[PDB]
C-alpha cells in the first residue's frame, strides 16, 4: 500500500482503524459474500469499551487503482448517518483490507422473518418496511442510488432496528441465487427486484429503488417467499411488460398492496417518493393493534 497517492492516504486517515484498536475472530465465518466473508470482532473506543463489529475481508483485489477507489468511496460513506442505514465504522489497512461494520445481532431481514420460532405480527412486518423507507428516504436525499434493495440486503440490530445495508464498502452478492449476468456488460443483476426500465437499459435511479422497495414490501408480507418463483430470470422483463405483477399476499392489507402497485408503475416519475412512502406507510402501520 506504499504505492498509494500520499494525499489520498491523508484524506482517508480519519476512516482508518489501527490494528491495536481491533480484536477480530477470524476462526469463525458469520456471513458470506461473494467478495468476502464476514467475521465478528470488537473495536475499542476511547475508554476501551468494546463495540461489536462485523468485519469483512475483501477477496479479489488485484491492483492499487481498486484500492484507491475503495478508499475514495470510504471517505464518502463514512460521513453518511441515519438510524435506518448501516454505518461504516472504518477500514483497517495494517492487518487483505478489512471493512469494519456494526455487528447486526439478528442478521438479515429475510432470514429473520423466515425464522419459524418467532412470530412478528403483521404490524411488526409493516414496521420493518417503514424503517427501510426511512433509511431509503435518507439515501435518496444524499442522491445515492442503492441498486440492490431487497430483504436479504437489510440487517437488524439488537434493538430490532432495521438498517439498509449492502451498499458502499459492504456491497456484495450475499445470496448468489438471485443475480444473473448480462451478456452485453458483465453486470450481475438482481433481476426479480429491478424496475422495468432498469431491465431494459441497465440504468438505475432512486425511482428504480422505489420499485425494489415494493418488492421488499411483498417479501415482508409473505414472510420471505421468493418473488416470481415460476418465472425464469430471463422471462421477467416480458412478464412485467405483459401487465403482470406480484399477487397480493394473503395477509397483506389492501392499502399496502395499493402502495406496492404504485411502486411498480411503468413510468418512474409516477412512483411515490420515499418521503411519500414513509408518510403513507406510517399511517398504515398506525392502524394495527
Ligand atoms: C442465527 N444468526 C447467527 C449470526 C448472527 C449475526 O451474524 C451477523 C452476520 N453479518 C453481520 C453483518 C453486519 C453488517 C454488515 C454485514 C454485511 N452485509 N451482510 C448481509 C448478509 C449477511 C448474511 C446473510 C445474508 C443473506 N442472504 C446477507 C447483507 C447486507 C450487508 O451489508 C454483515 N452481522 C452479524 C445473525 C443470526
From Swiss-Prot:
It is found in: Membrane. Changing residue 178 to C: In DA11; not phosphorylated in response to HGF; severely decreased tyrosin kinase activity. Residues 24-289 form the Protein kinase domain. GO terms for cellular component: basal plasma membrane; cell surface; extracellular region; membrane; plasma membrane; postsynapse; receptor complex. Changing residue 38 to I: In RCCP; constitutive autophosphorylation. Changing residue 172 to H: In RCCP; somatic mutation. Coiled coil: none annotated. Belongs to the protein kinase superfamily. Tyr protein kinase family. This is Hepatocyte growth factor receptor. It comes from Homo sapiens.
Amino acid at each position: 500500500l506504499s504505492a498509494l497517492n500520499p494525499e489520498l492516504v491523508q484524506a482517508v486517515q480519519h476512516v482508518v482503524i489501527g490494528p491495536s484498536s481491533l480484536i477480530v475472530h477470524f476462526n469463525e465465518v458469520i456471513g458470506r459474500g461473494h467478495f468476502g466473508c464476514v467475521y465478528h470482532g470488537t473495536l475499542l473506543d476511547n475508554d476501551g469499551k468494546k463495540i461489536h463489529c462485523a468485519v469483512k475481508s475483501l477477496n479479489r483485489i488485484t491492483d492499487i487503482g481498486e484500492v484507491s477507489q475503495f478508499l475514495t468511496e470510504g471517505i464518502i460513506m463514512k460521513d453518511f448517518s441515519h438510524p435506518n442505514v448501516l454505518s461504516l465504522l472504518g477500514i483497517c489497512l495494517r492487518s487483505s483490507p478489512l471493512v469494519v461494520l456494526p455487528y447486526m445481532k439478528h442478521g438479515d431481514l429475510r432470514n429473520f422473518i423466515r425464522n419459524e420460532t418467532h412470530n412478528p405480527t403483521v404490524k411488526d412486518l409493516i414496521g420493518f418496511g417503514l424503517q427501510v423507507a426511512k433509511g431509503m428516504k435518507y439515501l435518496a436525499s444524499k442522491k445515492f442510488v442503492h441498486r440492490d434493495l431487497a430483504a436479504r440486503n437489510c440487517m437488524l440490530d439488537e434493538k430490532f432496528t432495521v438498517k439498509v445495508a449492502d451498499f458502499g464498502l459492504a456491497r456484495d452478492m450475499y445470496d448468489k441465487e438471485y443475480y444473473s449476468v448480462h451478456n452485453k456488460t458483465g453486470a450481475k443483476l438482481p433481476v426479480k427486484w429491478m424496475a422495468l426500465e432498469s431491465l431494459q437499459t441497465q440504468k438505475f435511479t432512486t425511482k428504480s429503488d422505489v420499485w425494489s422497495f415494493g418488492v421488499l414490501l411483498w417479501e415482508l408480507m409473505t414472510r420471505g417467499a421468493p418473488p416470481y418463483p415460476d418465472v425464469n430470470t430471463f422471462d421477467i422483463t416480458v412478464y412485467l411488460l405483459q401487465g403482470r405483477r406480484l399477487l397480493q399476499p394473503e395477509y397483506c392489507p389492501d392499502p399496502l398492496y395499493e402502495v406496492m402497485l404504485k411502486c411498480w408503475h411503468p413510468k418512474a416519475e409516477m412512483r411515490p417518493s420515499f418521503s411519500e412512502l414513509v408518510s403513507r406507510i406510517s399511517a398504515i402501520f398506525s392502524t394495527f393493534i
